[PDB]
Structures are given as structure tokens and as C-alpha cells.
Symmetry: C3
Subunit: 208 residues, 3 copies
């Protein structure tokens, strides 16, 4: 059947994540009706018992679309630089006895705060995505994405920045995702507008 009761249903990640190697912030939600499973099965090949593997970290206030894929397990035992990509070490067969372990880690996959990931996007092992970034639907993200950068395609590539450099710097500095709730609640209208600078000047006089 289905983890989700409605197409329009978006459940917070911190109510469906079971894998100790997945670390999630508040409010970030996964919208998964079209692919059936909860968030855990978005995160592929991530051993939940091992402390020595690439981990997945997701900030707060993320929007994650249906069927998005986060690839873990690094090269999954396959070494293209070796004579064979075939994972002899992992096929239990008396003849593959002296095989070396091909498994190479790629680094953690870190998703910043306020990231919107489109439906069926695929994030490759070890990539870092900056706060406020947008990943177009069906993207295959193979390298790091800068804060507030919009990328898309396969492999994914620069489309544009959401805002000026000044505004990006103002956002990274004010880190509204970390405000007291009180402040957050007060600022809902500004957050639903394009007035980065007015929000910034305001925060400045309250906070500095």
C-alpha cells in the first residue's frame, strides 16, 4: 500500500526517519505519495548499524519531492580504476577468496537549510548542497551546489542564483532558520516576500 494518505500530504522527516545514519532538522518534510515508501527508502544503501560509513545530514525547512534519491555507500564496492568493476569481495564464492575490498567512501552528503529538492532528483554520493538551493525535478546532482543556487539537468548544472550576492550574504549571516520561534513567527510575512534587505536591517537592530 502507501505510507501517505494523500498526494498533497507532506510528512516531516523527523517523524519518519528510522535510520541512525540520517540526521534531519525541524520542519523539513518529504512529500512521497507517488512513490509509496517513507523517507528511509529514499536514502539508498545506507547501513543503519555502522558508524564508519558516509552519513546523510539534512538541515531544517527543506522541501523534498516525491521519489527523490540520495545515493549512499560511495562506489558500492566497484573500482573503475581496477581491472574489473565486478565486486568479487562481496560475492561469496570460494574462488573469489583473495579479493580486495573495492569499497571507497565518498564523504557525507550534506543538505543545508531551506533546500527545495524537486521530484525524482538524484543526489550522488558525498555531495554538499548549500542553504537556500533549488534542485530541479529529475536533476542528477554530481557535484556541490552553492548556497541559493538553482541547478538542473543530468548531470545537473548551473541555472542561476536566486538573489544578488549582497542578499545571499545577508541571508547566510542572519540564518533565520536559527531564530527563536517567537522571531520566526513574527517574520512570516517578510519571509513570504522578496524583501531580504528589509528583513536583514530589521534583524540587525534586534539582534546585534
Amino acid at each position: 500500500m502507501n505510507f501517505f494518505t494523500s498526494p498533497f500530504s507532506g510528512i516531516p522527516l523527523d517523524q519518519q526517519v528510522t535510520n541512525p545514519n540520517i540526521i534531519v532538522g525541524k520542519h523539513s518534510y518529504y512529500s512521497g505519495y507517488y512513490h509509496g515508501h517513507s523517507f528511509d527508502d529514499c536514502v539508498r544503501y545506507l547501513h543503519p548499524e555502522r558508524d564508519d560509513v558516509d552519513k546523510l545530514v539534512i538541515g531544517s525547512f527543506c522541501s523534498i519531492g516525491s521519489g527523490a534519491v540520495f545515493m549512499m555507500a560511495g562506489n558500492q564496492g566497484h573500482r573503475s580504476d581496477w581491472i574489473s568493476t565486478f565486486p568479487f569481495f562481496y560475492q561469496d564464492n570460494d574462488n573469489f577468496a583473495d579479493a580486495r575490498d573495492g569499497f571507497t567512501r565518498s564523504g557525507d552528503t550534506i543538505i543545508g537549510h531551506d533546500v527545495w529538492i524537486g521530484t525524482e532528483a538524484m543526489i550522488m554520493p558525498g555531495v554538499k548542497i548549500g542553504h537556500g538551493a533549488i534542485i530541479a525535478s529529475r536533476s542528477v546532482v554530481t557535484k556541490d551546489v552553492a548556497p541559493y543556487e538553482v541547478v538542473g539537468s543530468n548531470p545537473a548544472k548551473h541555472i542561476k542564483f536566486r538573489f544578488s550576492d549582497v542578499e545571499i550574504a545577508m541571508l547566510l549571516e542572519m540564518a533565520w532558520w536559527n531564530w527563536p520561534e517567537s522571531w520566526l513567527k513574527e517574520s512570516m510575512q517578510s519571509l513570504c516576500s522578496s524583501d531580504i534587505e528589509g528583513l536583514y536591517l530589521n534583524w540587525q537592530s534586534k539582534a546585534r
Copy 2:
């Protein structure tokens, strides 16, 4: 699974249930490899609301397995707002003053005799002209002209199916709208490359 076999292609009008999905006759979906009927091809389309973007598909379309039609516009996310988090749609009292981020994209309109390859994705608001071909796994972000072939992600121009004049002749004769009797009689001609023939034959019958 909703399809009895891999080769099983059921007409859209035998399976659509969403009032906001409008479909021609003959158009079929072969969705065996993705289990669900065609309704679930059409993502985020409210069936009750008369004020949201619609999906309109014409006659004689061939829609491949797990093709996707994205509705609901930006789905409440505003890239030009400070945050794309859809506060207005989240169940939280701290989000009471949020404004509504939803923006419609316009309707998605697929014309007649359009073939859409398996697992291709159609973005909100795109118009795809008559006789167009959308390659498998295409991500269709902009309108497709009549008899155009496009592919890739984002989908880009590959080819036209025919010359400008042939396209014109086909757009004028509009076989998909002929009386049923003419259609049955045109069967061998339609399974042919002979635009000019059929066109001249049509002219003497219809003008």
C-alpha cells in the same frame, strides 16, 4: 497492477476519473511497468476545484508507461520569496501569518496524435502540438510545436517529422476529426508515408 499484460494499452477514457483531466477517444496508456492506472500519472491535480490548472489531452495519443504530468504549478514554493518552504501549507500555528505561495502555471494541453515515451515528464503549463513526439525520459520544460520531436532533460529540439508544407497539409486536413466512415476508409493510407496523396484525396471529398 492495473494492467493485465505489458502489451496492454487501455484507452484514457476507460480509466480517467479526475474531472480536471479531459481526454480524446482512442488515446491510450500502457502502464503495466508502473502498475497504477492513468489518474496517478497526473500528479497533484485537485479533482474538486474549478480554479486550478487542467490537463487536456487530444485524440489518438500514445502514452508510455509511467509518463508523468506535473500539475499544481509551483506547488506552493516561491523561488523569489526569501524561503521556498511552503509555510502557508504546513500545519503549524507559528506559520499563521504566512502568505499563500501557490501560483498556477496555466493548463497542460496535449494535442492530437501525440506519442509520449515511457517515464517522460511534462512540467506544468506546457502545450504540446499535434503529431509531436516526446522521447522516453524527456523532461519537457517548454512548448513543443506540431510534428516536432524533442528529447533530453531539459527536452530540446531533435527533428521535425515532416517538411513545413506536409505539416501544413496535415494541420489543414485534421484527420483526427474526420467522420468515422472516412477514418475507416483511410486506414491503409494513414499507415503510409503519403501525406500528399491523402491530402489531395481529402480535398476532393471535403472542399
Copy 3:
């Protein structure tokens, strides 16, 4: 329910293929947990009962990622060069009675030995993939692929070769996938190395 018991489960192809028109070499495996189904449903539209359709041939020691797609049945009855792409012939309506059969074969799909196919890659009908090739995840493979070539993207495009032209000459020549299993057992450390030249010299003498 799911064919595979764990995400880390990889079942050999030869233990899960029931379709006579799929020919699979030894040790090749499909790691299919995330798409639930056995390999048979990776292979799309291959009529099991007939001998006049395109077939799938896969070499030994291949590694196939979850949800890889092998498109069979050529043009599926749709003729872009014809007036309509609508498959009249294949639909039941008395009005389509005199339709011509639009089906056309594409040739076999042939994956060589030692091929790694990334998750959710799509191999188009009739393509040939050379030994030791790597197909990136989400590739849409519309053209043939050279031995030891790495491709990715949609449509797939040349990224690079894994080895020099000489080293590729040597591997094609020594074809270690055909060695008796006894030899392989002695060669494991060499196969988990970048030493093509070393093993080559070891093979001839």
C-alpha cells in the same frame, strides 16, 4: 512484498530469469531491492514465446543497478515516418480493420562482459555495449558503447575510457572472464589492481 530481502542483496541473473529470450552469462547479478521486482521486469516488452523478436544478451560478471531498464520490442509498433504514430493495427476497434502492422525490429540488445550498469539507466532498443563499459546512473543509452568506455547523461555521451588504448587491447585480447575459474582464484589480487600490463605478461607465458 519485494523480490530482494535487503538493499545490499544482489541475486545472480541466471537465478531469476525466466524469459527464454533473455540470455545471461555467469556471475552477472541484478541488485534490485529499490524497485521490488526481479530482473524479468527490467526487460521491457520482450515476448517470451517467440523467436522472431529482438533478444537480450548479457555477458558474464556484469553488475546491474536497481531499476535499470532494457527496452525491447523496437519501435513498439509506432512509425514516425507514417502519418500517425497511433498503433491502429494493435488496437481493437472494427474501424482500424485495414491498418498496416507498424512494428519494426531494432536488432538484439547485447551487453558484453564486465559491464557495470548504474541504477535506473535506460538502454534503448538494439544497442550494443562493449566489454568493461560503465553506464552511469540515469543514463539514457541511445547509441553503442565502446569496450571500457564510461558514458553518462540523457542522451548518453562519452565521458572517458577507463584505460589507455594499449591496455584495452590487452584486456580484450586476454578476455579473463573466459578463463577457467581455477585461474581466476589465483588471479584475484591482480584483478583488484590497476596492473593490466602485469597480468597480460602473466597470461602469455
